[PDB]
Amino acid sequence: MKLNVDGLLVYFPYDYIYPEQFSYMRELKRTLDAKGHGVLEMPSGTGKTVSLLALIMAYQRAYPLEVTKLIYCSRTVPEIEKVIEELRKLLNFYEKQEGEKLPFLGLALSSRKNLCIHPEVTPLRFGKDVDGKCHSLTASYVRAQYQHDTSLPHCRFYEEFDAHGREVPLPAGIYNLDDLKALGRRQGWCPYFLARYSILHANVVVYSYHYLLDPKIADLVSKELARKAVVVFDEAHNIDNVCIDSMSVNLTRRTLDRCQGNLETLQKTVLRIKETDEQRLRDEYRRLVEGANPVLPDEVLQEAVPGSIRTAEHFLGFLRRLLEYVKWRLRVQHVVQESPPAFLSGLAQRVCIQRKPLRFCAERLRSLLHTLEITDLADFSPLTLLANFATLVSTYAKGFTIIIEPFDDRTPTIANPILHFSCMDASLAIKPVFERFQSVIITSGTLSPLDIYPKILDFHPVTMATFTMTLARVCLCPMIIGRGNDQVAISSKFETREDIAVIRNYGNLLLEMSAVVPDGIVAFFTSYQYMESTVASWYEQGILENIQRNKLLFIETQDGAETSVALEKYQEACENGRGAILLSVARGKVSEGIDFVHHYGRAVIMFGVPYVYTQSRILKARLEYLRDQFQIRENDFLTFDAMRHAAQCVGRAIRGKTDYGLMVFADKRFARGDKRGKLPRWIQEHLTDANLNLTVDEGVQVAKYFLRQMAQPF
Amino acid sequence: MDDQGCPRCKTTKYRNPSLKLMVNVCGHTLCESCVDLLFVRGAGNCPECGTPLRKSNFRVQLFEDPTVDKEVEIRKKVLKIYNKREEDFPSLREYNDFLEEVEEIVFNLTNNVDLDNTKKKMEIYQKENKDVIQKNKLKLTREQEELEEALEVERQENEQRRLFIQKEEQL
Ligand code: SF4
Ligand SMILES: [Zn+2]
Ligand SMILES: [Zn+2]
């Protein structure tokens, strides 16, 4: 299937493409031709990946100099595996068409914990542990000692990789993570480091955001080599939250105590090093005078001189002083306090800690800790986190804020206070990506309206188009139910949350919808506490028992183990005729991680508009700062955060292969024009005024009829 | 307040944390209920060490770590010296070399004998006070004044923003 696109001719593996695919390809080609960053939305969970990859490959063939390589990022490794599968299929199709191999390379990066071949680190699954063990095995000290070949466990894979892969790079091919593990085992090399080196000469590289956003690890692999590369973020509508998380650092009392203990161990190790080997490790002082990774981005990062901290004892005392200041500032009991610049000024005044020497604290920590030949960085990780916070605060506070919480939420009195350093704008941390890369395409599904995104992230978009899925059959028939059998408002307001009548309306709607809907249904609440209250009310009444009789019921919990077990049983229930009703939370990690396909989550129920609690002070900074700068109304941003989350958690049923399914929102709030307007275009256009505010019974009847229509073949 | 207790009367440190450390030439975790016990007999003598004190050598401080207490007080005293701004020296190394010597002096004073430090500090007193020390006292006073002025300007702007949006709504 060769498509005569306006720009050029583009190959395509599958037989047919919908008109929305034509629109997507033409708009994407327009953006690439303009060579300017832009954002676009496409409904389908699958199909967008293949269309995007095919268009990018064709554009690379036409103008190889224009685009050096493609950097395609996905939320999670299980998801990016499907992307690499799609890319492998596309490459096989193109190779068959051409009749011969071409110099094209495509690979996926992942954590050493996810992929590795060392038996010692294999049993351990905790990421910091894998990082520390690998650092110990690959340490420059361990490398030098391996040169001596003394009796000590040395990781042969990295040494063999240094010997061979340095000389010879991999010719070409596509390697999934699992297949790359096998390749590393066969060749006695690192599946991780081999891909890391291939990044230098790779046409396509795929990895999650935390490999491309956080300055600590993103920069090293996203160096200026890709000066003009097509960087693409997929389903990255929750990009602001992750970009903020890449900067926010949380300091707790337990973490601070662990830091103090680690610092004591550091002092003891320094004394032992002084008595054992002093001159050779002191040469570090000379190289320092000449002049865990830094959190400072490219331009913000500075390397002039370490500062007043030039020796191990001096640096240790500096960390002692800063840790004492943080300890006392956290121990203070008072209302939540915000102080972005005042915190730095008060630190400098109270404990005599100048911001310039504080700036290089984390970098000097890395160097000095390397000198100590520590067993691993896992033990001292809390100290490195505190150092990253210490350097960040002295680095900048213009678009940041230090929040102190002597008392935690959900606890009238708790002896574990927490100090947050949550950011307020993601533009600060995502600026390097936009500036360095010629164009970035934020391709997303279920995207809340694009107009806000340029305001939140400071960039000038080239194209702003919303693509609506078009099929010969109406795959999706969304509806909103606001009126119950009692013709009573069913809004899940904070003041209306306690309403037993509203809870009863929700329970009856779920009962009837489970009675009619086929096997497999997922209901998303607004919070764990609200979900528990509704479940308890239904349990006190007889509605819950009737729901249990009609279909099996499963519930989500904060604990990941129970969540995984419940979802595993839910899948089997969906396969069998019992069916299942999975209650979950919109913010729950399960909602974002899981993907619902044919005969999975057939009818997506949304109980109440997803709104975060109006007491969490972090969101207060994040929101009022957005009001002050970029001029976004607080209510506007709050409703945007609700609609984007709802679209995220309700857009799964249309994953791909044209699998029918209905999305019912049991809240009259969605019927409001603002919510409908902010809803994604593809869902909204299907939505109509006739079914906008159906009663519970009317919604059930129309759902039954729509399921009848979708049951029959094409 | 996290300290287990005074070397002698570790009681108050358990009942209430209101007591704050008292700095002395000895460098000690002294506590007010124990300061009264020192005043009653000796009147300015460390109980165990017996170090003489002119006038009780007592000043309030707030950190559970006695080493941090001594280090912070010594740094407070030292900052009065070597306060010249960085830009006064064009040499790249000299920017932080003198700070290295300053912190070395602080660590020296914390534990080792301070006689050499005092003699050196006399030498720096004579040579630098002639011109530079008083000049940088003036400049640091100017920057303290202007930082307090700038914070009051920030808070005037925030009060005006609050009250003007309130008057927008009511109008
Ligand atoms: S050097 Fe390679 S094989 Fe050895 S632990 Fe690290 S990633 Fe695994
Ligand atoms: Zn006492
Ligand atoms: Zn004493």
B57: left (phi over 0), alpha (psi -120 to 50) or beta: left
Residue A252 gets which letter from DSSP?
E
Pair type for strands A38-41 and A439-444: parallel
Task: With beta carbons under 8 A apart, name residues in chain A contacting B91.
Answer: none
Backbone angles phi, psi at A665, to 5 degrees: -110, 105
Contact state of A317 with B107 under an 8 Å Cβ cutoff: yes
Distance in Å from the first CA to the final CA of chain A: 23
Pair type for strands A694-695 and A479-483: parallel
Contact state of B68 with A321 under an 8 Å Cβ cutoff: yes
Residue A576 gets which letter from DSSP?
S
Q: Nearest C-alpha to atom 8 of ligand 1 is from which residue? A: A116
Candidate from A317, A328, A357 with C-beta closest to B71: A317
Mutation target to probe the B interface, by most B beta carbons within 10 A, among A351, A358, A629, A633 is A351
Give residue for tokens 């009065």. B80
- Candidates A708, A713, A650; CA nearest to A518 is A708
Task: Check if the beta carbon of residue A136 is closer than 8 Å to that of residue A142.
Answer: yes
Name the CA dihedral angle for A561, A563, A566, A568, rounded to a multiple of 10 degrees.
-80
- Candidates B59, B60, B112, B105; CA nearest to B80 is B105
The atom of ligand 1 lying closest to the CA of A184 is 3
Query: H-type helices in A491-582, by residue range?
Result: 500-516, 528-540, 543-550, 560-575
Radius of gyration over every alpha carbon of chain A, rounded to an integer in angstroms: 28
The residue type of A76 is T
Q: Nearest C-alpha to atom 2 of ligand 1 is from which residue? A: A190
The continuous run of DSSP H or E covering A442 comes out as: strand A439-444
- For this PDB entry, the determination method is cryo-EM
Contact state of A305 with B92 under an 8 Å Cβ cutoff: yes
- Number of other CB atoms surrounding residue A351 within 10 Å: 21
What whole-number distance in Å separates Cα of residue B143 and Cα of residue B146?
A: 5
Task: Check if the beta carbon of residue A655 is closer than 8 Å to that of residue A596.
Answer: yes
The residue type of A628 is D
Task: Check if the beta carbon of residue A384 is closer than 8 Å to that of residue A358.
Answer: no
Q: Give residues (CB < 6 A) around ligand 1.
A: A 112, 116-118, 121, 134, 137-138, 155, 157-158, 190, 192
- Reduce the DSSP state of residue A338 to 3 states and report it: strand
* A357–chain B Cβ distance below 8 A for any pair: yes
What whole-number distance in Å separates Cα of residue A647 and Cα of residue A445?
A: 9
Q: Nearest C-alpha to atom 1 of ligand 1 is from which residue? A: A158
What whole-number distance in Å separates Cα of residue A625 and Cα of residue A425?
A: 8
A259 marked as part of a ligand binding site:
no
Radius of gyration over every alpha carbon of chain B, rounded to an integer in angstroms: 23
Q: Nearest C-alpha to atom 5 of ligand 1 is from which residue? A: A134
The continuous run of DSSP H or E covering A481 comes out as: strand A479-483
Mutate which of A125, A130, A137 to test ligand 1's pocket (most atoms within 8 Å of Cβ)? A137
Contact state of B99 with A345 under an 8 Å Cβ cutoff: no
H and E: helices and strands count for chain B: 6, 2
Pair type for strands A418-420 and A403-405: antiparallel
Instruction: For residue B38, report the distance from its CA to the centre of ligand 2, in Å.
Output: 11
- Reduce the DSSP state of residue A604 to 3 states and report it: strand
What whole-number distance in Å separates Cα of residue A105 and Cα of residue A57?
A: 11
Task: Check if the beta carbon of residue A686 is closer than 8 Å to that of residue A678.
Answer: no
What whole-number distance in Å separates Cα of residue A52 and Cα of residue A25?
A: 7
CA distances in angstroms from A323 to A228, A256, A345, A353, B64, listed in the order given = 43, 7, 16, 11, 12
Q: Nearest ligand, CA of residue A156?
A: 1
Q: At what angle do helices A77-98 and A48-62 cross, to 10 degrees?
A: 50
What residues contact residue A45 under an 8 Å CB cut-off, 6+ apart?
Answer: A235, A445, A595, A651, A652, A654, A655, A656
Name the CA dihedral angle for B58, B59, B62, B64, rounded to a multiple of 10 degrees.
-30
Q: Which DSSP string do the residues of A388-413 spell out, in sequence order?
A: HHHHHHHH--TT---EEESS-TT-SS
What whole-number distance in Å separates Cα of residue A593 and Cα of residue A238?
A: 12
Task: Check if the beta carbon of residue A440 is closer than 8 Å to that of residue A213.
Answer: no
Mutation target to probe the A interface, by most A beta carbons within 10 A, among B16, B61, B62, B63 is B63
Contact state of A320 with B76 under an 8 Å Cβ cutoff: no
What whole-number distance in Å separates Cα of residue A406 and Cα of residue A420?
A: 11
What whole-number distance in Å separates Cα of residue A423 and Cα of residue A153?
A: 43
Task: Check if the beta carbon of residue A644 is closer than 8 Å to that of residue A675.
Answer: no
What residues contact residue B112 under an 8 Å CB cut-off, 6+ apart?
Answer: none
Instruction: For residue A331, report the distance from its CA to the centre of ligand 3, in Å.
Output: 28
The atom of ligand 1 lying closest to the CA of A157 is 3
Instruction: For residue B30, report the distance from its CA to the centre of ligand 3, in Å.
Output: 9
Task: With beta carbons under 8 A apart, name residues in chain A contacting B76.
Answer: 352
